[PDB]
Amino acid sequence: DFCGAIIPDNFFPIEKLRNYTQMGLIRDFAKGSAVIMPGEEITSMIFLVEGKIKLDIIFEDGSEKLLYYAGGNSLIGKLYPTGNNIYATAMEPTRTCWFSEKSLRTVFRTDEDMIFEIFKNYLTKVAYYARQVAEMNTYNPTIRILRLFYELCSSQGKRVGDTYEITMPLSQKSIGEITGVHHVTVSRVLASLKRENILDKKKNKIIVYNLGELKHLSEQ
Amino acid sequence: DFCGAIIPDNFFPIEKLRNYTQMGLIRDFAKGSAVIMPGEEITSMIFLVEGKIKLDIIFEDGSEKLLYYAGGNSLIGKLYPTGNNIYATAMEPTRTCWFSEKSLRTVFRTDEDMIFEIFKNYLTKVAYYARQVAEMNTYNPTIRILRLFYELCSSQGKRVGDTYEITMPLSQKSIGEITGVHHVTVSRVLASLKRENILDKKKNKIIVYNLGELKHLSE
Ligand SMILES: O=C(O)Cc1ccc(O)c(Cl)c1
Ligand SMILES: O=C(O)Cc1ccc(O)c(Cl)c1
């Protein structure tokens, strides 16, 4: 039931939707193919059976921004028109199941519990983006990066001896896109955290050596 | 079925939940009272029967930001813990109806259409805040104000002679809360639009005198 997310990746997965694929439409996408083409009117929820999708918004002038990444058991909630132009691409071989409104009605008639899993996925999304707007309007770029590391550590960090490890590949490019901070700032902040023996951001994991100092710095 | 919103006010209203408030819990709030107290854990959808609520987020340092305004038939979607500290206050005398998960099961067993109205309400919120993040990362403060005015005109400007009128009280304060732009920028932009005979943002209405020019300046 917990609908917090720290990064916009794998928002509240619903693995149980796999039990209802007969009620929807299976569609596959090779790496690089468009799951949602720019300008395409989507009126389906799109369940990712396995794979990976990058989901962006496109503005009227052609500029493009990351919204989120989605993996196995993720759900794209675009049942109705929203007024946003969306471009979603497969990052690897991807199988999806598309559920129209009518299809979903058959799902919920079979399994009431599915309604609430979907609410939990929408809610996780609203809480994520609503907080992010507010944080962007409150905290400077360096503080947003520190808050991100601190939060990630408290949500996903597992203590291995005298330290915490967060097992995820979080690229500097991805940090930039998620925080809306320019690359020199990202590199400099990450480089000082490593230098001062607080946190080392590696390719495959983040190691936090001093969580109280990271917290303390994030609060300045 | 349209799940757009230009301003964080009266997100996708659900009038038909009025039909089911006997399945929920009616709670009344006086003007100035906390509908959602700071620190309060909420596990109900909260339907606004009548009145008005200002709903804010509060950070660990006690700093606070507007998320939205809600009026009659609005829905607060806080059925599960989110990890955000939320503070919601009644701006007028307010009647609400609180729907637990259990109460919602009863609603949906009765009328399956309510499922989908709630989906529309959530989808409208996601689309609003996700777009706002991306725009904040795309467009400078002044262009975000212009875009706000042009999109409001396009969606609900009413033609009156050579003008378009947007009938709403939208304060300079609220313009800054919505756009994330500081007051001195908001005042200078509004004063320049008025100077240049493009747009006059008055107290209870906004008049657009040159739409094509506003369109152009926003781009
Ligand atoms: O389509 C939109 O405007 C925003 C959006 C994108 C992806 C999602 O999964 C949702 Cl719920 C909304
Ligand atoms: O509770 C939150 O973290 C965000 C929030 C606030 C109000 C709402 O109606 C929703 Cl759906 C979410």
Residue numbers in the entry:
A (entry chain D): 9 to 228
B (entry chain C): 9 to 227
Task: Provide the authors' own sentences about this structure as they appear in the paper.
The transcriptional regulator CprK from Desulfitobacterium spp. induces expression of halorespiratory genes upon binding of o-chlorophenol ligands and is reversibly inactivated by oxygen through disulphide bond formation. The CprK associated with the o-chlorophenolacetic acid (OCPA) reductive dehalogenase (CprAB) from D. dehalogenans and the closely related D. hafniense has been shown to bind OCPA with μM affinity leading to sequence-specific DNA-binding, and ultimately transcriptional activation of the associated cpr gene cluster. Members of this family are homodimeric and contain an N-terminal sensor domain linked via a long α-helix (involved in formation of the dimer interface) to the C-terminal helix–turn–helix (HTH) DNA-binding domain. We here present crystal structures of the oxidized ligand-free (3.2 Å) and reduced ligand-free (2.0 Å), OCPA-bound (1.8 Å) and DNA-bound (1.8 Å) D. hafniense CprK in addition to an intermediate OCPA-bound structure obtained by soaking ligand-free crystals (2.0 Å).
In order to avoid formation of the inactive, oxidized CprK under aerobic conditions, the CprKC200S mutant was used to obtain structural insights into the reduced CprK structure. Previous studies indicated that this mutation does not significantly affect CprK function and only has minor impact on DNA-binding affinity. The 1.8 Å crystal structure of the CprK:OCPAC200S complex contains two CprK dimers in the asymmetric unit, each dimer binding two OCPA ligands to the N-terminal sensor domains. Similar to the previously determined oxidized CprK:OCPA complex, the phenol and acetic acid groups of OCPA interact with amino acids from both CprK monomers through extended hydrogen bonding networks. This positions the chloride atom within a hydrophobic pocket at the dimer interface. In contrast to the marked asymmetry of the oxidized CprK:OCPA structure, near-perfect twofold symmetry relates the monomer structures within a single CprKC200S:OCPA dimer. This arrangement places both HTH domains in a position compatible with binding to the palindromic (de)halobox DNA. The CprKC200S:OCPA dimer structure reveals that each individual CprK DNA-binding domain establishes a small contact area [approximately 270 Å2 with a surface complementarity of 0.691] with both N-terminal domains of the dimer. A large proportion of this contact area is centred around an extensive salt-bridge network established between the DNA-binding domain Arg-155 and Glu-159 with the central α-helix Arg-139 and Glu-143 residues in addition to Glu-68 (in the sensor domain). In contrast, a significant set of hydrophobic interactions is established within each single monomer between residues Ile-14–Ile-15–Pro-16 from the N-terminus and the DNA-binding domain that leads to near-complete burial of both Ile side-chains.
